[PDB]
Symmetry: C6
Subunit: 205 residues, 6 copies
């Protein structure tokens, strides 16, 4: 990644073994549960495009997902090239294409040059946006259940039902009451409109 | 987070994999036992609003709780906007709204700008207060037992009973004697008023 | 905590995840065995009062002990206020009360101000003394056995007996010979006065 | 490796125990699955030739592979010498041969000298290219299955089949439809040409 | 400990959680096997007397050993006072007594003052010598077997016997041949005088 | 070890707990498999003679090997003294003997003095060479099998046989074909001379 040194200047640092392992392990343990995306974003803080590719390429499984991600990246790269056409001057900085932002046709030195320019051309952040767009699509695709099929069991505590409900809603990206069991539904109907989630959960506790 | 470098200036640093993992693991292991809150506060030392959202968003389970937390945050953000209305001057710092403090409508650069200003507009600390307010409500909601139902067993050591008693009191946020078993109750009654906890525990040991 | 940076100035640093985890884990594994106290002292090296409260508050179990600790802290804080009464001058440092030393009525900035003053008002060290006083009382209370009841078994190696003996003496805060078994007692009596522990252990080996 | 210090100058640093262990463990756990190569590249960021040899030499198993790698390295070193023949001037830098790039006939000091020269003679990066060339050949050799033999099972979810398909394609370095089961094949044929992977996976979900 | 900062000056640093845990764990796993002593010495690199006491005091078991260690320390401290008698000048450094070197009657600030003086009064190193003297005595005491009783089994590989032999010799602080089994003894006798250990082990392999 | 600080000067640093543990654990897990030697070399990067002795002395088992290593060290130290005889000038650096290089008769300060001299007298590197010489002898001695006895099983995959073959050759420090099974031998004979290992392994796959 690119970080500020103790002095203050923006310099390249090697991606750490801790970071590399953390990403690999969270994908192994969580697959594409929605919470993997904010973890990816945090683990890739200050990442160059090279670093972002390292993280994606170190994933051993889920190659259907990784291929879908490449499709999304290529679509975003194509849209970049449509909006930002490029025409080199000796010793000068060239303008980045989509494939340069994605790190496939740009060197680490070019990437550092763009990211540490004044003003910065934030190719790491632009690429991370494309990757997260693609990851969101994967999360949605691999979401196993419709919110319509999250219904409270006869003996299921309301809290556990609400956990399943909002877990599903997050993956899928009034109904809470409708999908509740008969006893809690009657209680929730009697609360009236404008009841908070806290008040509903207290009522059915 | 924002930290002091070796020189002395306040600079942004990436949230560490150690910090990220620590928070995820404590939520997995402790759920919303009261001690998770001081751990959250300590792990988010110097956190930007972006960092605070990262920590909250990396939690995979407990989505009922996370939704309740958003409600509390929105209530505090609304109360902020009521007390701090805002009317931009080229190259100047804009005043933060509630949603800017909560990191949903502000950039990392704006957040750094506010937190490192002279004097600082401590948006990280303000947001952390709102989050802890919401987390306290969750701890209280998920507290399984009333202090009224913590009573010493016939063969239960007094120490173990007192541990259950103050554990419950902490989660819920004279009675110790009343809820003691007959033998220890008689001993504690004979000590008289103004007895310390140490003296009570020695007496029933 | 407050530490020296690479330059030399005394600055605040965030309490580390390593430190936080280490303290939580040692309390989980050792409870209030006497060796937990020197570990606490070492883990809280350079700690502010805020840091000390973080460490104590992150403990999930042992709430009887934590309540007893608060009593001791309040007693020491009261004795501080008796010896150090306080009467603010704009932009100047106020004198710390007992509750300021204990971190309940003082801000982190005030704590840093006192600890980095010339000369320093070492509120972290003063509070740590009160905490260790309270922890010693807990260790003593939770010591399961009297030294009078540590007696060498008929087939117990002398070394194992001496380990139990001094383990108990440490928790409780001539008799070694008296509590030895008949065979080793006869050997130890024959050594005469002024025998070292090494010589006694060699004799009964 | 060679890294930038806090000041800014390029200096040698010892390879870390974390890095050493990470590489050894990934080879133990993944053998020559394709994802080991981007991990190698990332773990050897800024590596000298000495560091690269350390990483390769710390591998205990897979000595058939390590011997094949040496053959590839010697072929690349021979091709280097063909394109870059060398003819020493007191206190001056000599030109690197193939075996100097591979670290077998060059000292650490010579390697540092080349890599930190202005302009740099990047012997670490040149050697890493040769190693990755050799590792790719090994990955291909140890790929257990032809893509022709990756066919969807009668009850196999399409997603799991696509994972096997692209996993195999990656190791080996229209057919997706042809190798699908009868039911999904009919669905995929009906989509027509130009269907994305996302659309195919949605269709057979 | 006392270490050199990035600038070059000698400054105090907090003992790390890594160091604390490492020492506790090696004592738990190895007790007083001879190799624990070089580990202690390495883990206490640059240690103040306070740090050395922390390490010794964090040990939970082996209190017979810890009491014997105190006896040795007191003997060395007494011998120090005999050779170095002391007679304070405002703002000046006082001369260390034995108990000051052992950290029981000296403050951390005094210890830092002595260790960073020009020339340094190396109270950490002096105390570490006394501790290692005491630890050697404990290792010797807890050595379970005489070298006289290490004899090669009829079917015991010579290498395994030599491992037991020199392991025992190290703990206890011609005979190798005499204690060998009949078959290897005959082989070793035939080698003649001046045979190296390598040659003996090759001969009986 | 001796490392470059952030400024650039060569300074002594304490051997890390990570390094200490890594070495102990690799010896516990791998004994004297050939790959332990490059790990030793990497873990002892920049090591003083004191550090090298620490690493060797922290090994608890394998005392036959450690005694053989001392013999090799003493032989190299004797050969050093033969080639480098020494004749002290107040405040000046003395010339190192063999036992000074091996760290038994030299202080840490003397070792630092030699290693940071201009030009440096690299006593750490010289000693590390002697140690690795001795470790190679041990690896060879503890190699369990002759390469003559590595023959391909009737149903053994060629790859697994080649792994055993080159593993053995590495420990021991045409035949591949001769030791192959009948079916693969016929295939390898038909390839003719000058076949690469890759081509042989492809042929018998």
């Amino acid at each position: 990644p690119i970080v500020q040194n103790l002095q203050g200047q923006m310099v390249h640092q090697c991606i750490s073994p801790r970071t590399l392992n953390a990403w690999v392990k969270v994908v192994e343990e969580k697959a594409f549960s929605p919470e993997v995306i904010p973890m990816f974003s945090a683990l890739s803080c200050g990442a160059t495009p090279q670093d972002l590719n390292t993280m994606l390429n170190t994933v051993g499984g889920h190659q259907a997902a990784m291929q879908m991600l490449k499709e999304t990246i290529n679509e975003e790269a194509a849209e970049w090239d449509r909006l930002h056409p490029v025409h080199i001057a000796p010793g000068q900085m060239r303008e980045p294409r989509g494939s340069d932002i994605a790190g496939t046709t740009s060197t680490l030195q070019e990437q550092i040059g763009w990211m540490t320019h004044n003003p910065p051309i934030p190719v790491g952040e632009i690429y991370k946006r494309w990757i997260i767009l693609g990851l969101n699509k994967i999360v949605r695709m691999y979401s196993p259940t419709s919110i319509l099929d999250i219904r409270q069991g006869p003996k299921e505590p309301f809290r556990d039902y609400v956990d399943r409900f909002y877990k599903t809603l997050r993956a899928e990206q009034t109904l809470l009451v409708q999908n509740a069991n008969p006893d809690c539904k009657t209680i929730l109907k009697a609360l009236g409109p404008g009841a908070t989630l806290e008040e509903m959960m207290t009522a059915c506790q």
